[PDB]
Write a protein that binds this ligand. Structure first.
Ligand SMILES: Cc1[nH]c2ccccc2c1CCN
Ligand SMILES: [Ca+2]
Length: 223
């Protein structure tokens, strides 16, 4: 997260870190046994880390649970990043409390102008690299579809939205991949892609979760 603020320990209780020997992506806990992330985060041998603040120190609220199955969306296209969503089932159910909690799926799509919270452990610099150990947060609005398509001609599908600031300076970044965009207490987006981080006229692009609720629910019900 570039241009954000330190969230505070366990103030984003649905945020997960995906670990394969190191943090490589975020995700969101949607019930006691399932996490949603980006399809571009797929790999084998994922350990899901819940209750994290500092990802390099054991602080006492963590739960570490291996993934038993990953399901990339059937229509994910890695060249265009259309349908950039994946589900991960945990080997055992997490213990839910005030600091480890699920985030609700949306019943409707959020409109442009809605303020959202984006969080992650990604790079905090637009040029160069500095990775934080504690979770960072950013409040940002959903942008109109017209402004989004004007920023990325020919690249925005109906399964994507832009959020952030056309002036630059505040954005998600590398390592925030797969993390949550929460608006009005519901999961509306997944950190997906962009042109660099925090550049002028290049807001972040996010998977539009409201288009996937039926697939998520049907998949969880049968797996
Ligand atoms: C999700 C993601 N991952 C990256 C890696 C390098 C540069 C930009 C990005 C972005 C977009 C940030 N808004
Ligand atoms: Ca920790």
């Amino acid at each position: 997260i570039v241009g954000g603020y330190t969230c505070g320990a366990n103030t984003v209780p649905y945020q997960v870190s995906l670990n394969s020997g190191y943090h490589f992506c975020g995700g969101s806990l949607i019930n006691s046994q399932w996490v949603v992330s980006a399809a571009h985060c797929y790999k084998s041998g994922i350990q899901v880390r819940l209750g994290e603040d500092n990802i390099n120190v054991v602080e006492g609220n963590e739960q570490f649970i291996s993934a038993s199955k990953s399901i990339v969306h059937p229509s994910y296209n890695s060249n265009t990043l259309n349908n950039d969503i994946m589900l991960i089932k945990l080997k055992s159910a997490a213990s839910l409390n005030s600091r480890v909690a699920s985030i609700s799926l949306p019943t409707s799509c959020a409109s442009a102008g809605t303020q959202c919270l984006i969080s992650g452990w990604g790079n905090t610099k637009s040029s160069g690299t500095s990775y934080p150990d504690v979770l960072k947060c950013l409040k940002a609005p959903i942008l109109s579809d017209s402004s989004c398509k004007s920023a990325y001609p020919g690249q925005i599908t109906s399964n994507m939205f832009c959020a952030g600031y056309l002036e630059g300076g505040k954005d998600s970044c590398q390592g925030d991949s797969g993390g949550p965009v929460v608006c009005s207490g519901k999961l509306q987006g997944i950190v997906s892609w962009g042109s660099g981080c925090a550049q002028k006229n290049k807001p972040g692009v996010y998977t539009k979760v409201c288009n996937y609720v039926s697939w998520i629910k049907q998949t969880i019900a049968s797996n």
